[PDB]
Design a protein around this ligand. Structure first.
Ligand SMILES: *[C@@H]1O[C@H](CO)[C@@H](O[C@@H]2O[C@H](CO)[C@@H](O[C@@H]3O[C@H](CO[C@H]4O[C@H](CO)[C@@H](O)[C@H](O)[C@@H]4O)[C@@H](O)[C@H](O[C@H]4O[C@H](CO)[C@@H](O)[C@H](O)[C@@H]4O)[C@@H]3O)[C@H](O)[C@H]2NC(C)=O)[C@H](O)[C@H]1NC(C)=O
Ligand SMILES: *[C@@H]1O[C@H](CO)[C@@H](O[C@@H]2O[C@H](CO)[C@@H](O[C@@H]3O[C@H](CO[C@H]4O[C@H](CO)[C@@H](O)[C@H](O)[C@@H]4O)[C@@H](O)[C@H](O[C@H]4O[C@H](CO)[C@@H](O)[C@H](O)[C@@H]4O)[C@@H]3O)[C@H](O)[C@H]2NC(C)=O)[C@H](O)[C@H]1NC(C)=O
Ligand SMILES: *[C@@H]1O[C@H](CO)[C@@H](O[C@@H]2O[C@H](CO)[C@@H](O[C@@H]3O[C@H](CO)[C@@H](O)[C@H](O)[C@@H]3O)[C@H](O)[C@H]2NC(C)=O)[C@H](O)[C@H]1NC(C)=O
Ligand SMILES: *[C@@H]1O[C@H](CO)[C@@H](O[C@@H]2O[C@H](CO)[C@@H](O[C@@H]3O[C@H](CO)[C@@H](O)[C@H](O)[C@@H]3O)[C@H](O)[C@H]2NC(C)=O)[C@H](O)[C@H]1NC(C)=O
Ligand SMILES: *[C@@H]1O[C@H](CO)[C@@H](O[C@@H]2O[C@H](CO)[C@@H](O)[C@H](O)[C@H]2NC(C)=O)[C@H](O)[C@H]1NC(C)=O
Ligand SMILES: *[C@@H]1O[C@H](CO)[C@@H](O[C@@H]2O[C@H](CO)[C@@H](O)[C@H](O)[C@H]2NC(C)=O)[C@H](O)[C@H]1NC(C)=O
Ligand SMILES: *[C@@H]1O[C@H](CO)[C@@H](O[C@@H]2O[C@H](CO)[C@@H](O)[C@H](O)[C@H]2NC(C)=O)[C@H](O)[C@H]1NC(C)=O
Ligand SMILES: *[C@@H]1O[C@H](CO)[C@@H](O[C@@H]2O[C@H](CO)[C@@H](O)[C@H](O)[C@H]2NC(C)=O)[C@H](O)[C@H]1NC(C)=O
Ligand SMILES: *[C@@H]1O[C@H](CO)[C@@H](O[C@@H]2O[C@H](CO)[C@@H](O)[C@H](O)[C@H]2NC(C)=O)[C@H](O)[C@H]1NC(C)=O
Ligand SMILES: *[C@@H]1O[C@H](CO)[C@@H](O[C@@H]2O[C@H](CO)[C@@H](O)[C@H](O)[C@H]2NC(C)=O)[C@H](O)[C@H]1NC(C)=O
Ligand SMILES: *[C@@H]1O[C@H](CO)[C@@H](O[C@@H]2O[C@H](CO)[C@@H](O)[C@H](O)[C@H]2NC(C)=O)[C@H](O)[C@H]1NC(C)=O
Ligand SMILES: *[C@@H]1O[C@H](CO)[C@@H](O[C@@H]2O[C@H](CO)[C@@H](O)[C@H](O)[C@H]2NC(C)=O)[C@H](O)[C@H]1NC(C)=O
Ligand SMILES: *[C@@H]1O[C@H](CO)[C@@H](O[C@@H]2O[C@H](CO)[C@@H](O)[C@H](O)[C@H]2NC(C)=O)[C@H](O)[C@H]1NC(C)=O
Ligand SMILES: *[C@@H]1O[C@H](CO)[C@@H](O[C@@H]2O[C@H](CO)[C@@H](O)[C@H](O)[C@H]2NC(C)=O)[C@H](O)[C@H]1NC(C)=O
Ligand SMILES: *[C@@H]1O[C@H](CO)[C@@H](O[C@@H]2O[C@H](CO)[C@@H](O)[C@H](O)[C@H]2NC(C)=O)[C@H](O)[C@H]1NC(C)=O
Ligand SMILES: *[C@@H]1O[C@H](CO)[C@@H](O)[C@H](O)[C@H]1NC(C)=O
Ligand SMILES: *[C@@H]1O[C@H](CO)[C@@H](O)[C@H](O)[C@H]1NC(C)=O
Ligand SMILES: *[C@@H]1O[C@H](CO)[C@@H](O)[C@H](O)[C@H]1NC(C)=O
Ligand SMILES: *[C@@H]1O[C@H](CO)[C@@H](O)[C@H](O)[C@H]1NC(C)=O
Ligand SMILES: *[C@@H]1O[C@H](CO)[C@@H](O)[C@H](O)[C@H]1NC(C)=O
Ligand SMILES: *[C@@H]1O[C@H](CO)[C@@H](O)[C@H](O)[C@H]1NC(C)=O
Ligand SMILES: *[C@@H]1O[C@H](CO)[C@@H](O)[C@H](O)[C@H]1NC(C)=O
Ligand SMILES: *[C@@H]1O[C@H](CO)[C@@H](O)[C@H](O)[C@H]1NC(C)=O
Ligand SMILES: *[C@@H]1O[C@H](CO)[C@@H](O)[C@H](O)[C@H]1NC(C)=O
Lengths: 557, 557
């Protein structure tokens, strides 16, 4: 037999690459392309692939892009250096809100003004002074760390969905195997150009506004026997939650410099009220009993205890939640107060704390200040999942947890993998001299299909964001040219099928013509002879396509 | 008949693209290429094209580039934050100049010094104090808005001409139709690689140092019956204007911080004099009577009144003018003080105001401070055009106007349009299987010419400015490769003329062989069969160049 060169071979390799950031065509948006994701999903019949949501670079890539766009939005905003002064505070007489006085900087640098603003106790750090009941002195939290930046008017906290799209030459494989646990084989896969839109919703403990499971509740973890891993629970039903801050604050504007202002909380309209969340009781209870049972399947002969918060540090103990730019730290200890034993009105009130100083993304010194928001601050959302951490007592104790934002994205991106298409390949023949739809079928069947299908590959012919696009285009060109070049030197113009003068080595494969062509798919073949790739290429370029020209044409002198 | 593929077809599409910024080869200059514009203008005989100066992206592109380079020049300069202090001012006893005292910051931050500087009243804002005749207190204008930046020594105010040059694959079409009014057809066009140099001269009301009209005075507007549009008047003769500031100021240098100084006005040498402009009276009068008549042609049976300034706000009421970095706001109400009635020494003195705080480009907060300039501040220039705004009384009342800098560039760029060359095309033949100079002629004539001319297309084979160049090169490569690729798959190597096996459809065109080849130009043809482009390409790539290989070569097994 003889080596035949094929172009358009439906095989791929796992590969990492920068994906395009696509936005909403109807539209932190200037960086992304507002196009149609065109989710022309194709199912690959009879194809099984290995997915691993814990090693998915799309998650890491998203983490970086979410942070980067978020940071750009604060770039032109005011650094509140003038507020890192002694604050004289008194109790508001209109127990978490204090009335503080400052000597602020005026438009003129040689003048100061005495101004006041209201603050939440959580954002204020006492100096070496005690509560006297009338007055005491304070520092703003983080004045010993960073010049915290005020969010600008029109900074958007709208979790506008992001779509990731493959560069030409790459494809995104989606796992449709309902109940797939995030690792191992998926026996139902399909390919897309783009992912569904993912809303970069930021939270801890309770995952909000995501995609619900198609089947039953699925519990996923990198390692279920590792008590240091986060367990992601995907609900198949949403639970209604609505949060509100019913205390009518007024926004004041204080000049703190030559062309800049600070937005201060003040003039509380009459009543003092605690912020809270409204959670349906029957749905919460049903949800945990159902989660309990699924956990029991993973942890049999154990009592399940969804009974404890983290321990007391607000940053990790409460539910980090955003509402229209407002920041809530809600106490969920009343939700996670139950057990499960497999063989044994009507709402829930969650009190919430409000804080204006935000250590976003767990970074230190990258501080944002949230200005007060006037009006009806109420947000209604869907709990779609849980982040649980498993803790001797023949009991599996669980606590809600989080803070690693990657888990909020693994929870959506677990369905996707990125691979690189590798159109060249070889196989023996007896003759001497929608792209991946032909996958899961034998090489023979594909070779017929590819006489047409191979041409679908021809469809592939802001600061750092400008660079990401340039690298993407340059790489696409580079790979294209390398393949064109190899085909050129091998004498394979008319590349879909190219017979050559290189003989087949039984040492590469000793399978018969029909054993190979009718009992293997192209990927199986690629693996079986994969380490002879360089050998074959040398035989084709250094010998046969040189000898076949020199011994025929130079003789024509 | 049969479809024949042609390469080098002289057709084009209107297209937007980033143009190269070219500079003066003899030379805000580091960003542009100091090359030879090589204005090898070619006239296209018998070609009519549609131009629209009001929709010209070159104007918008220039606006951005002028601003961007101007801003880079101030990037390393000192922000005068130390001067936003209370100013104690007294009348200068050497009525617009005040003597002001400051407590300036010394090299050491713990010391202040009492210093003084002179200021123009226009740059000073009173505090809550009255004139007493001896002293009062002030703020510098814009200390409530922005930390105005001092122009550095060696910031250049030299309106160095810019040339725009087309990327390979693009051409710039120039309209040579004298009296063309900016819209509609131009019956005399030519192509260039580069535009003439355009000096980015900034002014309002009177356009200075531009290109004079070849013929008579031309009046252009997006809409002459719209009283909200600016009317651009292009003179065919220049009017001499010279402006001067004869008051001998001395430059003082005040340290205002650790490594930075402020340049202060002071020590007036003896005399106080008002700045002014010198305008020839006979030329001004002749110019307006001539403009009046041309306006009467557009607005017949009306009295024309060139009689009024904007109304009193210095920023829009006066003539914004620059002289060696100095900023003048001259009162032109004495120029625009006349009428016209179609059937009915020796100079003009224009008093001028001088201002050091500049809100360049109508932006707010992007403030520049102009340091005092010592010596003979006199500039002689050419008025080359007017920006007029038309205001019931059977009179057309005109006022000088401006502030939208784009109009200062539309006035030069009205002659140019950018188009993209599209070298591939098809036409029927009877056979089955300087680039645009051949334009305006029939396809037949061009097809002979193109056997040579098509090869001229082969000649096409700093921060953001680095990106503009990279995008330009990458795109040129991308387009090149796409065309090479299509020709490859269609079997059209030797691309200038390529017969194919695809039959001609009478449904695309039912014109005869000679009706098509001898009575149409290539652009006319491209329009007539333009929507069949994808149809033809599919027939060529999916069918004929696949079938023609498989049915001939695979049989050779
Ligand atoms: C899970 O998903 C839900 C649903 O999207 C989120 O809840 C929504 O959150 C958005 C904010 O991100 C809320 O939008 C705000 O609504 C205010 C009320 O709108 C009134 O007027 C509209 C007019 O058509 C009516 O339809 C509506 O019923 C009300 O009558 C607006 O005033 C807000 O405007 C602000 O932003 C715009 C943006 O351009 C500015 O121009 C405005 O000046 C102003 O700043 C804003 O539109 C939305 O109402 C919420 N819906 C619900 C049901 O709560 C959840 O928050 C999300 N979960 C999480 C955790 O985010
Ligand atoms: C319309 O077009 C006219 C013509 O170009 C412009 O008027 C000219 O504007 C430029 C400034 O942009 C003026 O240039 C300045 O001239 C000063 C006088 O030069 C003397 O020495 C030269 C030596 O050969 C003699 O030729 C000349 O007659 C004088 O004897 C210079 O001192 C200035 O130098 C400054 O810039 C250089 C740049 O490197 C620095 O090195 C110097 O230290 C210094 O900073 C400068 O050269 C020019 O004189 C003007 N000509 C006239 C006739 O006015 C108009 O301004 C323009 N219209 C508008 C609106 O801009
Ligand atoms: C989400 O996942 C949960 C968990 O699998 C699904 O719960 C299942 O709900 C059905 C009823 O709709 C339960 O069937 C009935 O349960 C009662 C309980 O006493 C029993 O008496 C009946 O004979 C019958 O079994 C089913 O058991 C229950 N599964 C579990 C494990 O509890 C839920 O339906 C899913 N929701 C969606 C939208 O798919
Ligand atoms: C710039 O455009 C103006 C406007 O078209 C041109 O003005 C024209 O100038 C010529 C003289 O050079 C005028 O011709 C003579 O005018 C006198 C006026 O009383 C008349 O008596 C003569 O019989 C003769 O017509 C011509 O009329 C005038 N046009 C208009 C509309 O007034 C000017 O010449 C142009 N300049 C250049 C450099 O081309
Ligand atoms: C926060 O404190 C300020 C002052 O520390 C309170 O404002 C004053 O209220 C008194 C009441 O008669 C007025 O007479 C003063 O003119 C107010 N202004 C100032 C600057 O003293 C303010 O009401 C307190 N805020 C709340 C919400 O209680
Ligand atoms: C996800 O499901 C896979 C498949 O059942 C689990 O992996 C198997 O774990 C058993 C445990 O002894 C092994 O014997 C199998 O060989 C494993 N198969 C594969 C393909 O890995 C995997 O552990 C599950 N993951 C989670 C988080 O539950
Ligand atoms: C394998 O995955 C494919 C894709 O999700 C499933 O196909 C869907 O089946 C539902 C059933 O009614 C259809 O409504 C969808 O339109 C189908 N999607 C597509 C893209 O065709 C398929 O059923 C899955 N097979 C199994 C066994 O789960
Ligand atoms: C989950 O991880 C834990 C450790 O992080 C694995 O259990 C331990 O693995 C080490 C590896 O050498 C052994 O020495 C320990 O004895 C193991 N612990 C126990 C209790 O046996 C655990 O096997 C991992 N689980 C899965 C499903 O991979
Ligand atoms: C959810 O919100 C509703 C109102 O929006 C709260 O309803 C109030 O509950 C108190 C409790 O005694 C009643 O006295 C009020 O009359 C109720 N309001 C109305 C309009 O009837 C409800 O309590 C909230 N739930 C939670 C969990 O806090
Ligand atoms: C601007 O004011 C300064 C002072 O306010 C004047 O300078 C002073 O002139 C008197 C005249 O005898 C001197 O004795 C002082 O030594 C000068 N310097 C200072 C710092 O007081 C200055 O002349 C005024 N400028 C103009 C142009 O009149
Ligand atoms: C620069 O600082 C000096 C500080 O001594 C200012 O002068 C004092 O201003 C206060 C204002 O009430 C007066 O009571 C003092 O009598 C002044 N002292 C002297 C010696 O004059 C001075 O005015 C500041 N400069 C400016 C321009 O404000
Ligand atoms: C520029 O000249 C063109 C050509 O004469 C003017 O456009 C014509 O306006 C008349 C007005 O009724 C129309 O009937 C013609 O059909 C128009 N022709 C074209 C080609 O547009 C155009 O209005 C003039 N523009 C200005 C600013 O005067
Ligand atoms: C059409 O435009 C061309 C280009 O401007 C004109 O050609 C110019 O004619 C003058 C007349 O003496 C020559 O001096 C120039 O050298 C010619 N330029 C070029 C590039 O050849 C042509 O005359 C115009 N035709 C009309 C009717 O206006
Ligand atoms: C210039 O623009 C004006 C409006 O900006 C045009 O005149 C008006 O066009 C609207 C369009 O529906 C009509 O409803 C008005 O009745 C028109 N006004 C008058 C007085 O008729 C005007 O036609 C435009 N001129 C040109 C030359 O395009
Ligand atoms: C243009 O500049 C010249 C000088 O450069 C000015 O001429 C002076 O005009 C006044 C007016 O009475 C005469 O007294 C002077 O004698 C003139 N100077 C000379 C040297 O003779 C002329 O006025 C300026 N024109 C304008 C419009 O201001
Ligand atoms: C459930 O079965 C397990 C089996 O080991 C047993 O230990 C546990 O006590 C049982 N629970 C009940 C409620 O019977
Ligand atoms: C705050 O009080 C004002 C008083 O008139 C009222 O109009 C406004 O609706 C209140 N806002 C909220 C959020 O209750
Ligand atoms: C806020 O919106 C909810 C939505 O129904 C409404 O019931 C509540 O009264 C609103 N509060 C204010 C202050 O308008
Ligand atoms: C197969 O590989 C062996 C390795 O030494 C080589 O000697 C032999 O000639 C090869 N045969 C073919 C068909 O290339
Ligand atoms: C390529 O090398 C790997 C190394 O483990 C081996 O497992 C695989 O079978 C080799 N393939 C071929 C074609 O020799
Ligand atoms: C010029 O002709 C117009 C025509 O309507 C007329 O109204 C106007 O009064 C005339 N002007 C003179 C000076 O005769
Ligand atoms: C300013 O006065 C000095 C005094 O000698 C003189 O030399 C200089 O030329 C004058 N400058 C101007 C612009 O008049
Ligand atoms: C012309 O187009 C029609 C459209 O249906 C098609 O049926 C016919 O075969 C075409 N003819 C040629 C020459 O391609
Ligand atoms: C292409 O579509 C446009 C749509 O208006 C039509 O006017 C034009 O004639 C069409 N050209 C062809 C070749 O059908």
């Amino acid at each position: 037999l003889w080596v035949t060169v094929y172009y358009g071979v439906p095989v791929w390799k796992d590969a990492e690459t920068t994906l395009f950031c696509a936005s909403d065509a109807k539209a932190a948006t200037h960086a992304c392309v507002p196009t149609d994701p065109n989710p022309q999903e194709m199912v690959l019949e009879n194809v099984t692939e290995n997915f691993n949501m814990w090693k998915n670079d799309m998650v890491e890539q998203m983490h970086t892009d979410v942070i980067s766009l978020w940071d750009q939005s604060l770039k032109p905003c005011v650094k509140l250096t003038p507020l890192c002064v002694t604050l004289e505070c008194r109790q508001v007489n209109t127990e978490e809100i204090k009335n503080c006085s400052f000597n602020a900087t005026t438009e003129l640098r040689d003048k100061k003004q005495k101004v006041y603003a209201l603050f939440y106790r959580l954002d204020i750090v006492p100096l070496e002074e005690e509560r006297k009941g009338n007055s005491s002195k304070y520092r703003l939290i983080n004045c010993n760390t960073s010049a915290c930046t005020q969010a600008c008017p029109k900074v958007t906290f709208d979790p506008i969905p992001i779509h990731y799209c493959a560069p030409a030459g790459y494809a995104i494989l989606k796992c449709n195997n309902k109940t797939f646990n995030g690792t191992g084989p998926c026996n139902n896969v399909s390919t897309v150009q783009c992912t569904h839109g993912i809303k970069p919703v930021v939270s801890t403990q309770l995952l909000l506004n995501g995609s619900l499971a198609e089947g039953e509740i699925i519990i996923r973890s990198e390692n279920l026997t590792n008590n240091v891993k986060t367990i992601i629970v995907h609900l198949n039903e949403s639970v209604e939650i609505v949060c509100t801050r019913p205390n009518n604050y007024t926004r004041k504007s204080i000049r703190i410099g030559p062309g800049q202002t600070f937005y201060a909380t003040g003039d509380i309209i009459g009543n003092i009220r605690q912020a809270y969340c409204n959670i349906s009781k029957d749905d919460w209870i049903r949800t945990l009993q159902r989660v309990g049972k699924k956990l029991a399947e993973h942890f049999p002969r154990r009592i399940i205890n969804f009974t404890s918060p983290a321990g007391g540090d607000l940053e990790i103990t409460t539910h980090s939640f955003n509402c229209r730019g407002e920041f809530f730290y809600c106490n969920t200890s009343s939700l996670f107060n139950s057990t499960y034993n497999p063989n044994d009105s009507l709402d829930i009130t969650i009190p919430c704390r409000i804080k204006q100083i935000i250590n976003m993304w767990q970074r230190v010194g990258q501080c944002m200040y949230a200005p007060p928001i006037e009006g009806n601050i109420t947000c209604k959302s869907n709990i779609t999942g849980l982040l649980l951490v498993r803790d001797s007592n023949e009991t599996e104790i669980f606590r809600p947890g989080g803070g690693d934002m990657r888990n909020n994205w693994r929870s959506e991106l677990y369905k996707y993998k990125v691979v690189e298409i590798k159109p060249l390949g070889i196989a023996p023949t007896r003759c001497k001299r929608g792209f991946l739809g032909a996958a899961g079928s034998t090489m023979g069947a594909a070779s017929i299909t590819l006489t047409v299908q191979a041409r679908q590959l021809l469809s592939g012919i802001l600061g750092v964001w400008g660079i990401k696009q340039l690298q993407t285009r340059v790489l696409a060109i580079e790979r294209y040219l390398k393949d064109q070049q190899l085909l050129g030197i091998w004498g394979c113009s008319g590349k879909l099928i190219c017979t050559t003068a290189v003989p087949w080595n039984s040492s590469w494969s000793n399978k018969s013509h029909d054993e190979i062509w009718g009992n293997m798919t192209w990927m199986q073949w690629d693996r079986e002879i994969g380490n002879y790739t360089n050998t074959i290429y040398r035989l084709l370029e250094d010998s046969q396509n040189q000898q076949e020209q020199n011994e025929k044409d130079l003789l024509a002198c």
